[PDB]
Design a protein around this ligand. Structure first.
Ligand code: ICW
Ligand code: MG
Ligand code: ZN
Length: 312
């Protein structure tokens, strides 16, 4: 009979897409659990295992500016918001899997891109030739599942356990933004030729793909002061990578060069047009109730336009 309840402001704001989880680390575990209980059920996961699993995941995120424990809970909230606004479209198994897939999706991120692992010649690039970090994140997810007392899916049948771990795997892989562009193009066509069908599992995998890129990017769907201060977190990682690239004797792309701070507004603009806006556009078309994400993304587009004209 043991539910989590949140202060009134949070209980009410958490159901909105633009919810920010705030600066009190110690609340994020309760917030996550609250989300699982409302989205999935009180029964979905034995609470002793869920808590112990949540705390091992936290322990395995590093202290990097952006790809941190706070990013993990943020992405899981965006997924919660999608699943609560589309509650008949998804299986019991997808609801379980995706919230766990989102929390785990950047486990053990070092704050370096797949490109920097390859050019450094890091061991993980030898183990995994594409989607290097993403396959590492899935690997660490299995690791923490197999720690004693941590199997939150112990109740699942052999088949169900295999189906969910597959959902999680494809979910995490999809957060590889290099795979997104093609995934959205195919989902664009299928919808517009009327061929998109959610009883086709290969089609459901694509939709979940896009969902995962939507949640992963949801910093651009927040209030402007949250979007603005998150863009500082992202650029600090990128400028640290460019420094490292320089140390290998390679000019980094301008995105990653700190001597090119000033072209950031123009950079975030490019990003909204080429990635975020298409992502949230195609997602709205497929799942109409996700519109707020597109509305909020457009508002922040317009706020970067305004920075460029030195109106702020
Ligand atoms: C992968 C990713 C995730 C998110 C998450 C927060 C939502 N935001 C993001 N912003 C950027 C970075 C965009 C970006 N800056 C530039 C740039 C910057 C300065 C000088 C020159 C060029 C190019 N380009 C594409 N990547 N990115
Ligand atoms: Mg990632
Ligand atoms: Zn991420």
């Amino acid at each position: 009979l043991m539910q989590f309840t949140l202060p009134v402001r949070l209980c009410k704001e958490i159901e909105l897409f633009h919810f920010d989880i705030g600066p009190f680390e110690n609340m994020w575990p309760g917030i996550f659990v609250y989300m699982v209980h409302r989205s999935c059920g009180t029964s979905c996961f034995e609470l002793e295992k869920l808590c112990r699993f949540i705390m091992s995941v936290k322990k395995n995120y590093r202290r990097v500016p952006y790809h941190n424990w706070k990013h993990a809970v943020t992405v899981a909230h965006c997924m919660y918001a999608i699943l609560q606004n589309n509650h008949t479209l998804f299986t019991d198994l997808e609801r379980k899997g995706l919230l766990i897939a989102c929390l785990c999706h950047d486990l053990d991120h070092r704050g370096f891109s797949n490109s920097y692992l390859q050019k450094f010649d890091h061991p993980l690039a030898a183990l995994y030739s594409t989607s290097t970090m993403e396959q590492h994140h899935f690997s660490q997810t299995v690791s923490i599942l197999q720690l004693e007392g941590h199997n939150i899916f112990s109740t699942l049948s052999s088949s169900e356990y295999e189906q969910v771990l597959e959902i999680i795997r494809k979910a995490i892989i999809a957060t590889d933004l290099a795979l997104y562009f093609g995934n959205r193009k195919q989902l664009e066509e299928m919808y517009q030729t009327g061929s998109l069908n959610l009883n086709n599992q290969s089609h459901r995998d694509r939709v979940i793909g896009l969902m995962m890129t939507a949640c992963d990017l949801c910093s651009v769907t927040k209030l402007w002061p949250v979007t603005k201060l998150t863009a500082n977190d992202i650029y600090a990682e990128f400028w640290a990578e460019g420094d490292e690239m320089k140390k290998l004797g390679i000019q980094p792309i301008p995105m990653m060069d700190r001597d090119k701070k000033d072209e950031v507004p123009q950079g975030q603009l490019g990003f909204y047009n080429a990635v975020a806006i298409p992502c949230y556009t195609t997602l709205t078309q497929i799942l109409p109730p996700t519109e707020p994400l597109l509305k909020a993304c457009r508002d922040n587009l317009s706020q970067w336009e305004k920075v460029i004209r030195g109106e702020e």
